[PDB]
């Protein structure tokens with residue numbers, strides 16, 4: 001995985017909700033404390049259009065167009081930066 005590529009994608013597309021340090025602002029889930037496998041699995045679920053939690057509709061649009069490479073890069077960044 002490419003941590004730098006994941007960082008750039010996170011900063012552009014994810015940070016507004018999940019935070020610069022992954023803590024999730026006031027109401028969005030934190031992405032701290034989770035490894036790359038976990039993040040990969042979750043992003044793949046959202047991308048596939050699975051119902052995850054009660055607020056799937058807020059998150060799913062942000063996963064729908066991710067490639068597998070994107071997912072791997074994001075997951076590597078999140079693990080390195082926030083775990």
Ligand code: HEC
Pocket residue numbers: 010013014015016017018028029030031034039042043052053054055056057058059062063074
């Ligand atoms: C705010 C509008 C969001 C943006 C932008 C992104 N995410 Fe998100 N995410 C958001 C919510 C409300 C939720 C919960 C949805 C639900 O199932 O009820 C999530 C969830 C995640 C998760 C799962 C967290 C966990 O299970 O521990 C991950 C890993 C996650 N989101 C990652 C993520 C990334 C990488 C994003 C940019 C591509 C992204 N999110 C955008 C809200 C928002």
